[PDB]
Design a protein around this ligand. Structure first.
Ligand code: PYC
Ligand code: PYC
Lengths: 335, 335, 335, 335
């Protein structure tokens, strides 16, 4: 058996959304800042992303992260989020899995009450309170980048079909479009996952074509990579169901940590939330994250908030991914 | 890290369609015959299938197989095909993967012109000619179960939409419905993969409600588990594009071996194919299989054929698939 | 990367003495009875034994076991013991290792109070009582082949040096040469391990040359493959320290199992033990086994006993062992 | 299954002498310089070394290296040798292993004529020319620290037995005590490996007690951690047989790399070698290295040489090493 290249990685799941965490396939990535490290990857080893996020090794949806050398102070190691599309600037389910697994494997040397983990992440730092119940990780409270309301509703226009009106956009690590499922008239359920998909991505794009997308700091992002559609929850707990469309038409199985932290900055600046006050966000599956607002913060030029998301991940296998250099799909394909 | 259970299994890929080959999770499966080993599994360890085929470990589509102690004469080891749906009686892409990887890992001590592998399978035996080019596996000619035309056009009736007419059915390890893409007016392409998927499974069901499905021997099958839609290829090589829908609404990335070994028996009995005479089947991807008729044979009560399917697989990972017994999805979910 | 072959195996350790258990690197081995499997191996795939037990993948000492398809009734799977030297007919630390790991990995589904495991082995059957503490394997009570006192002392003659006298020989799966460390004047300790080693294998040999070695039943063993030297323990618990020399001049880091089961018979028939009554055996490391006599039995011609040995193993790694066909030592070497 | 920590590491062998290369069990180790890393390890995670290099996982002899983050310029990654004893400051077998595998696995993207690798190491930098035969790694020319003749013969005194005279000492990364096998009267063979072992360490020690051991530069080594014994080769090729004793009484299955780079400096400065001119060194196994002198250099105070050692490693298995926290020998033991 010829192979050439051999990638080691840990398959987790945070609330059903898969994270595949890379470990040993490369010993070294320079980058410098954790946005530079991401750019390096993208413009150099995209072939690793595609190979592992696409078929045949992965699938549409499917999601993963690289565990780096940090460079940074305070932060243990550094995280680069990747997907079937590209490289997400920030990801809650990801952050969760990463941390869960770091401790689990004992890459971190675990502390009993809780374990604090400071990770890099392309967009600012992140900290994860990792509850451990003597023996196990019980769950994880990640505290996120400054999230905020961006552009108050704003008119939308959707060619297919009708050309509707109101919807809000907000940051939370990336830029989410938050639109209500009544607004376009979708049922945030298994039924329509694909119509949701094509609806989401079609909005994302024609939103990305003709808008002002900009962070008044970090000055790189300037994109609406994400579409959150939400509606009343058919679970008793949780304040809403959301589904989150992203990366070349994929859909999150979790409520999307970055999507909840964004949504929390677009309550609050609305009134319907006070600092703390348990938020719970329902996904499109039957799974739920325990969000809440922590503090106030005016980012660069306009008011904002720093929110705390609280999920939990499980280990679902170890891989030695390999590529037979004959395999004419050795760097993977889509559909 | 607590884990309780630990499954060893090699990811492969025949022509795009994944085959996840199980190796070392269990050291015993009694069954007896390779239909009695499939029942055992079905009724007992189904938890294995679901866990591996279904998220978060696998996906909708996705496919695999258990390498088993043989019992049988001639045959080396014994195969059991499993899928997002259930336990396919026979599968080419799988038999290909299973052979490729048996040799490639040196479970089979490789012979240099070609290696002959006799595998069990739920429906009859199968022999793989394995072409090895000093070092590597170059490709695989699998010679399939007796295929044959079964019924002939016959009544159709599709509620959504219109209620059309002609279409054929035939056996090639499993019972295929072979209906032209003009017949229901679908384009066998990426575009519509999903409408094809819901179309396929709806026909497969309402066809299985009101028909005569029966193999005159083996006397267990009696089902139309599969829907082959075909049309003129938009690849210069290959006689037709086919797309195969099966198991709980999933689609084969390959042309389907059993689908091609079926569709060969329902030419020939048609005139448009002489014994030998290269058939090439284009999948729904861009991939192709080199099929061709080998010999004549009347099965039990009616005339038939024994076809040869020729493809090729690649290794794409080694896994220690583990279940955290805290992982509430530890046996996996659908959508 | 280029490898041809790829063995799966799990590294354990039973009271320090390593047991490497083989899993996935073959799906079949015919043999028939768990002596005819051992002969098949010995006289066909010795190149597995040497490759794993010898350098550069194993070492002097080192020990391992093959998990097989059973064939037999009652018995789950089947075990084949192998060492630097050859294939050991029965081993306690092996049987322990094998059982602990079977359950732990979930190749056996675990039963809560205890799990019973019936394993084949090249000398009879063996049953392991697997104590599981809700979650974990606590330890293991293996119940062992009819042990007995064979040949009352008998004179030894040792060239280097002097030429001494008394020492006894027994059976407990294999034939043990029990001799007191005061008899040859050795200190069963770290200090002299190697003089013990060479003293042992010289006795074993020149004993094997000029004696009557015979089991009245099974009629294949007829060998003294083992040398047990014992003295007053410098651990408070345990009735003695023993060290066990075997297979091409290696030494057992555990008290040995088969060696303890042997020695128990040759108390008892001595008067210094009553059915039950805790025996504890100290190794040549600081590690201990909990042995005790279960019931009487006169084997074929002469009186005997059936003993129980109690220990506990730990997992120390997972291996995808591979052989680069260019690696001139692919099948390994000794010194 | 329950496991505290999970270490990814690749087993190799350079000319029979094992090198176990760590990969993924950690993502970080601060240190700073590839000495200050080695110290950090030595005075913090000596529980890694001992676990892996000692039983039950490793053995007496046995050896392995850590692949690090570099910090340094030019150099890809960084290397930390480790052995049954401590942490070798430089080692040929290692630097070879480490390079062979880095390319072979595709951690380095391979260049066809030869790949150049710059690795850190505790003692300076090293560069490896890695010869790749289109597909494979054929062999590896590592260029080594300025070697030299230190102290002309000097009288030894050996208590067991007689008390002999002449023997030289040199540097090649570490300080080698080169003495002829006629000098003490030992046959550098299998027969006496253990008398050689105990002779070596006893010399190494009583040499370290009463001598002047000093590098004029780097100012941290000041030790004779190595004992080379050499004699006429009973292999046609190779100028001499040497066996190399080090680290807590272990023996080197290769000729030693550092031990050859040393010995080369103490020919040459002797007149029996001209710049280039193939030197070949035989090991205490039948195995050889292709050494030669590259260029002159007077280190700090006294004359010297920079040599080039040429060998070739092979992968022998992939490990997920795991420690059951119950495993009382979790951190491993000696004898
Ligand atoms: O889980 C999340 O935070 C996420 C990021 C992108 C989609 N979901
Ligand atoms: O290629 C095949 O054999 C197959 C079976 C089911 C789907 N494809």
């Amino acid at each position: 058996m010829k192979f050439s290249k051999g990638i080691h990685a840990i398959d987790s799941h945070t609330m059903g959304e898969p994270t595949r965490i890379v470990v040993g396939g490369i010993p070294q990535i320079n980058g410098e800042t954790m946005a530079d490290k991401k750019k390096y990857l993208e413009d150099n080893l995209d072939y690793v992303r595609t190979a592992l996020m696409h078929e045949p090794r992965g699938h549409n949806d499917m999601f993963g992260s690289i565990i780096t050398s940090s460079n940074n102070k305070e932060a243990d190691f550094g995280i680069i989020f990747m997907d079937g599309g590209g490289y997400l600037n920030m990801c809650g389910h990801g952050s969760i899995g990463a941390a869960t697994v770091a401790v689990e494997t004992g890459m971190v040397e675990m502390v009993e009450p809780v374990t604090n983990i400071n990770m890099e992440a392309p967009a600012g730092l992140i900290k994860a309170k990792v509850m451990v119940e003597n023996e196990k990780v019980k769950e994880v409270s990640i505290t996120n980048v400054p999230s905020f309301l961006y552009m108050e509703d704003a008119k939308l226009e959707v060619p297919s079909l009708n050309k509707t009106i109101t919807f809000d956009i907000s940051f939370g690590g990336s830029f989410f479009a938050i639109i209500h499922a009544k607004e376009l008239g979708v049922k945030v359920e298994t039924s329509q996952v694909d119509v949701l998909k094509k609806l989401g991505i079609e909005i994302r794009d024609l939103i990305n074509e003709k808008i002002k997308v900009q962070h008044p700091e970090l000055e790189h992002i300037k994109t609406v990579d994400l579409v959150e559609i939400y509606d009343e929850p058919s679970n008793p707990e949780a304040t809403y169901k959301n589904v989150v469309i992203f990366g070349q038409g994929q859909v999150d199985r979790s409520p999307c940590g970055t999507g909840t932290s964004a949504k929390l900055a677009t309550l609050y600046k609305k009134g319907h939330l006070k600092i703390d006050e348990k938020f719970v966000y329902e996904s499109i599956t039957g799974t739920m994250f325990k969000g809440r607002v922590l503090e106030e913060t005016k980012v660069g030029e306009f008011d904002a908030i720093i929110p705390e998301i609280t999920g939990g991940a499980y280990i679902t296998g170890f891989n030695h991914f390999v590529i037979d250099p004959e395999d004419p799909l050795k760097y993977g394909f889509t559909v």
